[PDB]
Write a protein that binds this ligand. Structure first.
Ligand SMILES: NC(=O)c1ccc[n+]([C@@H]2O[C@H](COP(=O)([O-])OP(=O)(O)OC[C@H]3O[C@@H](n4cnc5c(N)ncnc54)[C@H](O)[C@@H]3O)[C@@H](O)[C@H]2O)c1
Ligand SMILES: NC(=O)c1ccc[n+]([C@@H]2O[C@H](COP(=O)([O-])OP(=O)(O)OC[C@H]3O[C@@H](n4cnc5c(N)ncnc54)[C@H](O)[C@@H]3O)[C@@H](O)[C@H]2O)c1
Ligand SMILES: NC(=O)c1ccc[n+]([C@@H]2O[C@H](COP(=O)([O-])OP(=O)(O)OC[C@H]3O[C@@H](n4cnc5c(N)ncnc54)[C@H](O)[C@@H]3O)[C@@H](O)[C@H]2O)c1
Ligand SMILES: NC(=O)c1ccc[n+]([C@@H]2O[C@H](COP(=O)([O-])OP(=O)(O)OC[C@H]3O[C@@H](n4cnc5c(N)ncnc54)[C@H](O)[C@@H]3O)[C@@H](O)[C@H]2O)c1
Lengths: 334, 330, 330, 330
């Protein structure tokens, strides 16, 4: 009986709706002042990356209708002006990338949202990564939470397993990352990130991440012990983390593999996966896991110095986690 | 010398700039966009498609020093605020994509420029000029358009075909590189739904007024040509695919000979001619606005034929903007 | 059920294999390639274009087990050595691209199979059949060709347009996805120089026999159509751009109505019709061999029009290979 | 003047050829591949990555004429048949990828050549040489390897870091451009299953001995480095991402200073240094085999750091192949 409202009908917003449909989570409304109901029908029905929506999508009376389920469409610029009250005061998935802080996201609370999940890192909202620290959620004090970044959702579950079994002394991460909507088709203006303005399809582009540092927030023992960066590359979806770490306890690569397998089969099922296959990025397009450990791509120099590789669908895997988190949060209502 | 201000330091703006460095009749004295001088320097210096800038660029006192010369940098959103007169600008290359009517483009004249060349098709009755078609029809007008990249490819070819054999009717497709108007991943493009889809993932049908526009620069072809586009995952260089019905019977060898003669003749530097096994990257940096691909074309018969012509949508068009600037300043 | 063997587990081989699992009339019992069983399992399970195999695949001992079913895996370079009869194969899907004449394809029949469907246009007098065009002209022949992906797109459309309005003459372009014959970077392709050039970097002009081959499956159109191709940097899905002169005058609305009627009628499952703002990825996985794009097409007049039709060159073709397997064994 | 023959006119063979035109110490006098001279001419003339050839190429009497210089063209699969001494070849650039052991490379010497440079890491104990690392260790051996493009990027950087701060241990990733060994669509690569997956669709993990090989050209670093690769959909230019633990504590600024001093000093022309906001295409045509990207790297602490260095895998390596040829001829 959770009800969800989506703010921002973009890559994340549309695929969050898709995952909601797949799981029987009722989405009651979508707000996006840049996409009208008819255009919403088009954007949701056809997807270059994830294929046609498998079901029906129609517009009727200014509503988005998906598999005969009617979704109210709002067209409001400001969170505090969105009529969340008119659609039963749902949880709000904040997926615009514009309202990131507790203060900005709290605009939804004013207009009737019961809780807000920011689908990105926030300067101040508590980060919750399913499988890592979701129990940190305190419904008594937290109306606005962050589901962290896609990369953090990949790195953290792996980091947890490795750190708990062997101890991570220090780590440096690279993520080789698919391009996204913030990038440009041809060299264009990106005042705040010059490299990120260069043509997305022509280039390997060094890029900044705070994901590795953010892992030290959700796993406090790792605070100060990880940092990293990214390379943006000409793929449309799916990314991979490349974690180089020093371990406190000696660990053969077989021991590492067995620890990941156990976590994957047990307490992190559905979050962390484990493979030994000769996979590539497209093998995880549409994969619901936060992190798929690639056993054969990794390499150890010695029992204390290893490079680990884990895949993630930054679009659809992350959207699964948004939905998992709001369902978990709803389960915690007193 | 002709003093040029560039409004919009985008793909066209910056490639117009580079092309101006190799001309002595034209110097760029000022650049406007929505960006700091240091970022402008970076955007000039490095180019994913055309490589590093040939020469020196530095920032000094909030302005650019390019190959020794100071270029004023401004960041005015409203062209009327541009004070083009302060740098004695003759002609503005209007390359933002935002000011394609007389009314909007005239803000530059208000701001002190003498004339404006729109680096795109005019959205009103502002006259369009395509080198090799109708430059000589320029009549002292203060605001003009250089048409589109596709019209610049199509018109020269169409004129040669029509002058020699008579185009009864023609339909055109342009298989066209990705541009700045497209999106990296499926995103909002409310005026053009298809145009919002991931540029690198898709063949994307697109609308073009380029074939109709040929009718405006070559009135004899009015109503005889229309067409469309497919946008494809390449960063630059496009190709015209022209299907024409010919009045006068012409063998493919005769079509080849007519195009070659115009290329070496009255259309030298506009229309080019090749018989090599070329692909799109072979024209990256091409200055000719229409390069006829002899081996790629195909005739069904002597009156029904498919012609192919390449163009660097960035470089070819940018050179012709300068050509138009020089022409209207004669 | 019809027992089928695949020769060549490439793009077509594998996609035929996937489409066969959905069918009750056809069972794949054996595959031949130059590959180990484990590698074949790998290639089937994971697909960059079409995602993971919907089902189970195992190599037990052994022994390719797909959806509980044992598949014989052989590695014979020479089709004569196949021993099809040993696993009871009726029909061979010949998908190597290497055995496209009766002489070569007949090796399957001497190896114990009853009939052969070539998954490409024959290089000799081997009859071609295109579903929606001339399946009913099949006359018990033991070796047939399903023609090309492009022919499968153009033929059904051409037939509908010809039947209704009379095609005087037409010229075709296919804007086509890259395929296995191309190169990742500029490499050797001695029979097709252009096709050696970096696939992901270029628009690559290419010869095609698909429009002429329409004249074979629809004899009434012999010598009336030709065309060519542009290979572009997309992994799958292609589009036909057909420029036609019509005998009987037809508005675009009458063209649309005619295509829609055939799509809902006699050509259901072959010819499709859409009015949506589609792009290529929207047809990745499309079973229809020719999906007419209403909004994309354009008419100059009632007798001269450009028509646009989509096809998943991998999936559509592969489904029709199976449709031909079914038909010839009725 | 050192006379050289190229065996394998592929990416490296053709970029080596272009790099040699600018040298006074080296002349290419003969090329062998599996192609006709006219095709060879076409492949030289046009390049998707590096543009059209800067100069004249012609075919006469079955051989090449490049800027008025006659070049012998042969098409022998077997190096033993090459008769290198009939054209006065001193050194063969061995660039097929096929002949990377002494036994196979030696056939060139048998065929009359004096010395051989393998354009790839040796598969046996054939000594490897990397400029900036160990050219001075060369001892007149008649067969040598210039190692890999990646080792050429890593070794010069690793040396500077080791000499100044001491590398305790290091792990390397190279994010690497697509190359000729890869496939345009999911295809057979029984050697390297990931490598058969469509190059333009995927990030593709790849194993590499490049980090280990640094221990061969810098024995002080033996056993201290290893790594892997990710292949990505770019046509050219790659980057090293080196994660190292340091014996002596060093700020990131002190690292930058050390690399810069070497780039301006001992490693000049080999190791480059930049502080600009560069991306891969900014190094297309780069001659330095390692360009340190100061802004891209990151330190966790004074002893644990991630370092970033670019290389044009085609151009940098090809230039150092010529450097090695010059060096062994001194
Ligand atoms: N794309 C990814 O791989 C990814 C993964 C994880 C998290 N995220 C995060 O999720 C957020 C959205 O990312 P995305 O890729 O979907 O971006 P997107 O550009 O695809 O979508 C953003 C959407 O927000 C809408 N929007 C803008 N202003 C709005 C407002 N005033 N009110 C309502 N809607 C508004 C836009 O119309 C657009 O549809 C960002 O914070 C991003 O960092 C992205
Ligand atoms: N790219 C091509 O192949 C091509 C070819 C021919 C014509 N054109 C035309 O040229 C024009 C621009 O094309 P482009 O590809 O360079 O686009 P672009 O996006 O690369 O360039 C637009 C530039 O204008 C700037 N800008 C936006 N608003 C501004 C303002 N108010 N004042 C000053 N600058 C502003 C942007 O920051 C950007 O740098 C368009 O009309 C386009 O149709 C493009
Ligand atoms: N892919 C398409 O869009 C498309 C569409 C229609 C028709 N076709 C046709 O289908 C045929 C195959 O095309 P593809 O795209 O699958 O090519 P492909 O390269 O993907 O498949 C060819 C397969 O045949 C195998 N093979 C080579 N020699 C063999 C031998 N002698 N014995 C057994 N197997 C052998 C290869 O290992 C490879 O797996 C060609 O005739 C092609 O023209 C392709
Ligand atoms: N491409 C790179 O970034 C790069 C960089 C450094 C080193 N290398 C190495 O250089 C070598 C060649 O690589 P490439 O990328 O140029 O590959 P490539 O495929 O482009 O070139 C191989 C060439 O050799 C020809 N050839 C094949 N067999 C032959 C034979 N028997 N006799 C004569 N010629 C024959 C082929 O036709 C082709 O032109 C490999 O060892 C590779 O690992 C490549």
């Amino acid at each position: 009986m959770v009800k969800v409202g989506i703010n921002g009908f973009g890559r994340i917003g549309r695929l969050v709706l898709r995952v909601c449909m797949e799981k029987g989570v009722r989405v009651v409304a979508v707000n996006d002042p840049f996409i009208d109901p008819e255009y919403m029908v088009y954007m949701f029905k056809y997807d270059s990356t994830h294929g046609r929506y498998k079901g029906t999508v129609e517009h009727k009376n200014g509503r988005l209708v998906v598999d005969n389920l009617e979704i109210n469409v709002f067209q409001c610029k400001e969170p505090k002006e969105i009529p969340w009250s008119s659609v039963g005061n749902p949880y709000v998935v904040e997926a615009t990338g514009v309202y990131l802080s507790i203060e900005a996201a709290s605009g939804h609370i004013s207009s009737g949202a019961r809780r807000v999940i920011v689908t990105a890192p926030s300067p101040d909202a508590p980060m919750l990564v399913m499988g890592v620290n979701e129990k940190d959620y305190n419904p008594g004090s937290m109306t606005v939470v962050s589901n962290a970044s896609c990369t953090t959702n990949c790195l953290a579950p792996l980091a947890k397993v490795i750190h708990e079994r062997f101890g991570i002394v220090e780590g440096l991460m690279t993520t080789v990352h698919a391009y996204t909507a913030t990038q440009k088709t041809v060299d264009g203006p990106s005042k705040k990130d010059w490299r990120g303005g260069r043509g997305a399809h022509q280039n390997i582009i060094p890029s900044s991440t705070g994901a590795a540092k953010a892992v030290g927030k959700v796993i406090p023992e790792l605070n100060g012990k990880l940092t990293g960066m990214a390379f943006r590359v000409p793929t449309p979806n799916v990314s991979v983390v490349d974690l180089t770490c020093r371990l406190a306890q000696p660990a053969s690569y077989t021991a590492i593999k067995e620890a990941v397998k156990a976590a994957a089969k047990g307490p992190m099922a559905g979050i962390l996966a484990y493979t030994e296959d000769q996979v590539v990025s497209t093998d995880f397009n549409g994969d619901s896991h936060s992190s798929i450990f690639d056993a054969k791509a990794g390499i150890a120099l010695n029992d204390n110095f290893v490079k680990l590789v884990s895949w993630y669908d930054n679009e659809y895997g992350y959207s699964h986690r948004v939905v998992d988190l709001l369902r978990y949060m709803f389960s915690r209502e007193k | 010398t002709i003093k040029v201000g560039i409004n919009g330091f985008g793909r066209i703006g910056r490639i117009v700039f580079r092309a101006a460095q190799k001309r002595s009749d034209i110097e760029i004295v000022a650049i406007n966009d929505l960006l700091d001088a240091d970022y402008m320097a970076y955007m000039l210096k490095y180019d994913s498609t055309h490589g590093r800038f040939d020469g020196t660029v530095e920032v000094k006192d909030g302005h650019l020093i390019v190959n020794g010369k100071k270029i004023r940098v401004t960041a005015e959103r409203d062209p009327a605020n541009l004070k083009w007169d302060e740098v004695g600008v003759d002609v503005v290359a209007e390359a933002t994509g935002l000011f394609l009517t007389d009314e909007t483009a005239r803000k530059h004249i208000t701001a002190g420029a003498k004339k404006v060349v729109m680096t795109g098709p005019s959205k009103d009755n502002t006259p369009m000029f395509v080198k090799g078609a109708n430059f000589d029809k320029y009549a002292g007008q203060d605001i003009v358009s250089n048409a589109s990249c596709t019209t610049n490819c199509l018109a020269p070819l169409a004129k040669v075909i029509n002058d020699n054999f008579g185009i009864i009717e023609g339909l055109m497709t342009t298989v066209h590189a990705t541009t700045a108007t497209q999106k990296t991943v499926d995103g909002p493009s409310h005026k053009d739904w298809r145009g919002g889809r991931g540029a690198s993932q898709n063949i994307i049908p697109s609308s073009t007024g380029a074939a109709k526009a040929v009718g405006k620069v070559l009135p004899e072809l009015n109503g005889k040509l229309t067409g469309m586009a497919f946008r494809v995952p390449t960063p630059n260089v496009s190709v015209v695919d022209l299907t024409v019905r010919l009045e006068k019977a012409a063998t493919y060898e005769q079509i080849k000979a007519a195009v070659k003669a115009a290329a070496e003749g009255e259309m030298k530097g506009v229309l080019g001619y090749t018989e090599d096994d070329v692909v799109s990257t072979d024209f990256n940096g091409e200055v000719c606005t229409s390069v006829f691909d002899a081996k790629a074309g195909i005739a069904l018969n002597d009156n029904f034929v498919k012609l192919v012509s390449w163009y660097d949508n960035e470089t070819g068009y940018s050179n012709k903007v300068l050509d138009l600037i020089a022409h209207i300043s004669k």
